[PDB]
């Protein structure tokens, strides 16, 4: 019984039912959709009682069973970056997604017309992550067609395996076919599978000197033929492979402030043959897996679904007021923990006549503010509701808490006791995380003090509090 020392008697009852179900052969069911290993946990009556996310099956965990996670779109997301709103590229042309040129024209409305044509709907200059990936994969097909039409590159491309082909395509995106064709000796070595010799002359170039970090990852990919160079980068600001602690931390922040938008989430252990174990463990009796356990909610849908409905069919005033107060709680939760991956699909709405459930809280608590505020924005700040000033209700509930030193100290101590669970816990890195959180709390205190809006809140310069 690994879960003998839980601090929540009601939650401990849930875990007991989960273990009883496993003892009788009712195992947690792996979920097919996600980019990581998540499981619907059942009770002895085959009822879903929670969602379990093992640490080892996180997107870059060593036992993540969803191999479709490693693809060219995710490769270029790290190397080039993803933007879901129209922007201007290095050469001043309108662009969206991962470097997808919309038009050479300086007219913005021309860019939106082309964007609506490519996506297939009225986007108004904003697309979803899935739409960007579909657009990106269309660019990849075009790039491959050009490679196969190029006499210098096609024989190399045919010889390369799938992983190394992504590396070659990566170079084509960055510098074009002509630029890649200039790596004469490296291309010949790659075709001969002399990886190390190819890497030597890949590093003797303008490309390696101008963008060394991206080039080193691409060159390492050529050397190994694996995706190891893109694993556990933590987006440059997160502790790698600690999503389970971020999930549990988000509820911990929620519960202290009584936001009641994050379902109860705790760090627990579970044994189940449906988990992904290595060969050694399975032949043995399986070792428990540590991960986050979140209670199951029902009746919810992606916020993107309900937001589009409300734009064409506005809510009645009383319901709209309730939705805004729920939205404010989401804003406060995401800002304090500095969530880096809250898209308008990662939070759920049920339509208390309307309720918000905050899930997928695995990519929060960075140890530093992101260098590019445009790289990981709070995507709910692009909604019209983000410009409504914080209600007097939310300020009377939150300001007394966050303006008190003991509350902030207790919250930091609670997060310490939780985050120290991980094998890779580092005291200095944790103190960086709290300095970032205190800076977020400081800005939030000022924003509520000045009656600002969520849109104005995210514009305050980020800061750390030592």
Please give the residue ranges that form the binding site for ligand L6A (CB under 6 A).
Answer: 31, 33-34, 38, 51, 263, 294, 296-297, 359-360
Nearer to ligand L6A, 51 or 447 (CB): 51
Q: How far apart are CA 390 and CA 388, in angstroms?
A: 6
Q: How far apart are CA 148 and CA 146, in angstroms?
A: 5
- 270 belongs to an annotated ligand binding site: no
Query: To which H or E segment does residue 196 belong?
Result: helix 195-202
Other CB atoms within 10 A of residue 150 CB: 17
- 322 belongs to an annotated ligand binding site: no
Closest CA to 432 of 358, 350, 338: 338
Nearer to ligand L6A, 357 or 444 (CB): 357
Q: How far apart are CA 368 and CA 448, in angstroms?
A: 23
- 41 belongs to an annotated ligand binding site: no
* Residue 36 CB, nearest approach to ligand L6A (Å): 9
Alpha-carbon distances of 230 from 31, 108, 137, 234, 255, rounded to whole Å? 24, 35, 19, 10, 35
- 201 belongs to an annotated ligand binding site: yes
Nearer to ligand L6A, 302 or 414 (CB): 302
Q: Count H helices and E strands in the chain, helices first.
A: 18, 11
* Residue 33 CB, nearest approach to ligand L6A (Å): 3
Other CB atoms within 10 A of residue 60 CB: 18
- 173 belongs to an annotated ligand binding site: yes
Q: Is 126 helix (H, G, I), strand (E, B) or coil?
A: strand
* Residue 243 CB, nearest approach to ligand L6A (Å): 10
Nearer to ligand L6A, 173 or 251 (CB): 251
- 457 belongs to an annotated ligand binding site: no
Q: Name 95's bridge partners.
A: 87, 101
Nearer to ligand L6A, 194 or 355 (CB): 355
Q: How far apart are CA 289 and CA 287, in angstroms?
A: 7
What DSSP designation does 40 have?
A: E
Q: How far apart are CA 174 and CA 207, in angstroms?
A: 9
* Residue 298 CB, nearest approach to ligand L6A (Å): 7
* Residue 39 CB, nearest approach to ligand L6A (Å): 10
- 276 belongs to an annotated ligand binding site: no
Q: Where are the alpha helices (DSSP H) in 369-420?
A: 392-402, 405-419
Nearer to ligand L6A, 296 or 373 (CB): 296
**DSSP sequence for 3-37:** TTT-S-HHHHHHHHHHHHHHHTT-PPEEPSSSSS-
Q: Show me where the chain is broken: residue before each gap, C-N > 2.5 A.
A: 284, 351
Contacts of 139 (CB under 8 A, 6+ apart): 98, 99, 100, 173
Q: How far apart are CA 19 and CA 271, in angstroms?
A: 8
Cα 30 from chain centroid (whole Å): 20
Nearer to ligand L6A, 94 or 380 (CB): 380
Q: Show which residues are catalytic.
A: 80, 89
* Residue 101 CB, nearest approach to ligand L6A (Å): 31
* Residue 360 CB, nearest approach to ligand L6A (Å): 5
Detail the residues annotated as belonging to a binding site for substrate: 101, 173, 186, 201
Q: Which residues are annotated as a binding site for ATP?
A: 38, 53, 294-297, 308-309, 360
Per the annotation, binding residues are 38, 53, 101, 173, 186, 201, 294-297, 308-309, 360
């Amino acid at each position: 019984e690994m879960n003998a020392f839980l601090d929540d008697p009601e939650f401990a009852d849930i875990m007991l039912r989960a273990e009883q179900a496993i003892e009788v052969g009712i195992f947690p069911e792996r979920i097919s959709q996600g980019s990581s290993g998540s499981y619907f946990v059942k009770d002895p009556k085959r009822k879903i009682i929670g969602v379990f996310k093992p640490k080892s099956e996180e997107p870059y965990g060593q036992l993540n069973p969803k191999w479709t996670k490693y693809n060219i779109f995710e490769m270029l997301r790290i190397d080039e970056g993803l933007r879901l709103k129209i922007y201007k590229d290095t050469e001043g042309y309108y662009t969206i997604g991962i470097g997808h040129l919309l038009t050479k024209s300086p007219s913005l409305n021309a860019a939106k017309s082309e964007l609506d044509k490519a996506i297939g709907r009225n986007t108004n200059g904003v697309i979803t992550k899935d739409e960007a990936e579909k657009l990106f994969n269309q660019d990849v097909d075009a790039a491959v067609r050009g490679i196969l039409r190029n006499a210098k590159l096609k024989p190399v491309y045919d010889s390369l395996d799938a992983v190394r082909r992504a590396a070659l395509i990566n170079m084509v995106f960055q510098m074009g076919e002509t630029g890649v064709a200039g790596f004469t000796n490296s291309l010949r070595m790659l075709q001969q599978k002399r990886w190390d010799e190819a890497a030597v002359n890949l590093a003797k170039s303008r490309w390696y000197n101008q963008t060394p970090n991206r080039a080193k990852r691409v060159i390492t990919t050529f050397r190994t033929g694996t995706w190891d160079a893109y694993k556990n980068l933590g987006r440059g600001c997160l502790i790698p492979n600690q999503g389970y602690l971020s999930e549990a931390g988000a509820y911990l922040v929620d519960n202290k402030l009584h936001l009641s938008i994050v379902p109860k989430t705790k760090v627990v252990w579970l044994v189940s043959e449906t988990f992904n174990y290595n060969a050694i463990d399975r032949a043995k009796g399986l070792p428990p897996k540590i991960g986050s356990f979140q209670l199951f909610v029902e009746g919810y849908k992606e916020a993107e679904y309900w937001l589009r409905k409300f734009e064409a069919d506005p809510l009645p005033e009383n319901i709209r007021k309730q939705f805004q107060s729920q939205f404010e709680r989401l804003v406060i939760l995401d800002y304090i923990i500095r969530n880096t991956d809250r898209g308008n699909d990662n939070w759920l709405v049920r339509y208390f006549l309307i309720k918000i459930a905050a899930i997928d809280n695995g990519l929060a608590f960075p140890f530093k503010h992101p260098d590019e505020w445009r790289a990981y924005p709070f995507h709910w700040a692009w909604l019209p509701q983000a410009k409504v000033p914080f209600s007097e209700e939310i300020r009377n509930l939150i300001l007394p808490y966050i303006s008190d030193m003991n509350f902030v100290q207790d919250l930091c101590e609670d997060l310490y006791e939780l985050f120290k669970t991980d094998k890779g816990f580092d005291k200095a890195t944790f103190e960086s995380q709290m300095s970032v959180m205190r800076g977020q709390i400081l800005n939030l205190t000022q924003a509520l003090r000045d009656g600002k809006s969520p849109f104005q809140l995210v514009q305050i310069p980020c800061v750390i509090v030592e």
